[PDB]
């Protein structure tokens, strides 16, 4: 990583933490922020380091490769490189593969990240990676939000737990999520709680809904 700005190598505890996260949690949504937390200030070299140390799950890692190549090709199309000798006071403009770390040295990445008018290649590559990771989290989610229904004896709290877990795995736009919250949550409750939630009103908070079905 680079920290306030000086360069540093990725620590053993960071790398081992990421490896154990992938081992234990597979591709649960909370893996993605963890990743973003273990890669704060990372160069593309550190990100490739974290990705390459994953044993197994090679189908998902290959999908991530293809996503990264898509984003790199899009960056290349939007940022066409100009022909000409690089001036003494300048550094070359990065291609998509340079941002992915495969065609750029560590010194070039540091140069882009520190030089005035900064090109944050680490955060760009990081965004691409998180995009692919979200694709993988969605594809590996074993449930659909439409199938989450409260059991007749299920306490309301557990039903809300499952519901918002699956919803977190859905990863649709926030307006769609608001719609699912305002419709499916009360729609798919069990009769006892469903009646009370209907009696609450269309604009009640989650706190009011959970405290309304607490004794029930």
Where is the binding site for ATP, in residues?
A: 13
Q: Using the rule CB under 8 A, is 26 a contact of a second copy?
A: no
Structure tokens at 126: 């990081």
The CA-atom distances, in angstroms, between 160 and each of 72, 142, 152, 192 are: 39, 17, 14, 15
Q: Is 52 in the site for Cl ion (CB under 5 A)?
A: yes
**Binding-site residues from annotation:** 13
63: closest CA among 137, 138, 132? 132
Rounded distance between C-alpha atoms, residue 138 and residue 68, angstroms: 17
Radius of gyration of the chain (CA): 23
Asked whether position 129 contacts Cl ion by CB under 5 A, the answer is no
Select from 23, 33, 178, 195 the one that contacts a second copy (CB under 8 A).
33
CA angle, 49 then 38 then 53, to 5°: 25
What's the closest the beta carbon of residue 93 comes to a second copy, in angstroms? Answer: 22
> If contact means CB under 5 to 8 A according to the sort of partner, which of Cl ion, a second copy, none does residue 10 touch?
a second copy
Residue 22 binds Cl ion, judged by CB under 5 A = yes
Q: State which of positions 36-65 bind a second copy (CB under 8 A).
A: 36-38, 40-41, 48-49, 52-59, 61-63
Residues linked to residue 2 through DSSP beta bridges, in sequence order: 7
Nearer to a second copy, 6 or 83 (CB): 6
Specify the residue, 23 or 66, whose C-beta has the smaller distance to Cl ion.
23
| Distance of closest approach, residue 117 Cβ to a second copy, in angstroms | 14
Helical axes 121-139 vs 106-114, angle rounded to 10° = 110
What are the strands, taking DSSP E only, across the chain? 2-3, 6-7
d(CA 38, CA 35): 5
Give the residue with the Cβ less far from a second copy, 83 or 117.
117
Q: Is 113 helix (H, G, I), strand (E, B) or coil?
A: helix
**Binding to a second copy (CB under 8 A): which residues in 126-145?**
135, 139
Instruction: For the CB of residue 182, give the shortest distance to a second copy in the complex, in Å.
Output: 13
Q: Output 27 or 164, the one with its CB closest to Cl ion.
A: 27
Other CB atoms within a 10 A radius of the CB of residue 156 amount to 21
Residues 157-216 that bind a second copy (CB under 8 A): 157, 160-161, 163-165, 167-168, 205-207, 210-211, 214
């Amino acid at each position: 990583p680079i920290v306030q700005m000086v360069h540093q190598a990725i620590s053993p505890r960071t790398l081992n933490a990421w490896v154990k996260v992938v081992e234990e949690k597979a591709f649960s949504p909370e893996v993605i922020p963890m990743f973003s937390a273990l890669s704060e200030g990372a160069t593309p070299q550190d990100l490739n380091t974290m990705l390459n140390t994953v044993g197994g799950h090679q189908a998902a890692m290959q999908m991530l490769k293809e996503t990264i190549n898509e984003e790199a090709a899009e960056w290349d199309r939007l940022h066409p490189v100009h022909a000409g000798p690089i001036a003494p006071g300048q550094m070359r403009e990065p291609r998509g593969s340079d941002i992915a770390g495969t065609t750029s040295t560590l010194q070039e990445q540091i140069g882009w990240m520190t030089h005035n008018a900064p090109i944050p290649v680490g955060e760009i590559y990081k965004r691409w990676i998180i995009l692919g990771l979200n694709k993988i989290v969605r594809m590996y989610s074993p449930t659909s939000i439409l199938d989450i229904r409260q059991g007749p004896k299920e306490p309301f709290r557990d039903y809300v737990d499952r519901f918002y877990k699956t919803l977190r795995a859905e990863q649709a736009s926030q307006e769609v999520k608001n719609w699912m919250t305002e419709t499916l949550l009360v729609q798919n409750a069990n009769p006892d709680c469903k009646t009370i939630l209907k009696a609450l009103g269309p604009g009640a908070t989650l706190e009011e809904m959970m405290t309304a079905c607490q004794g029930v």
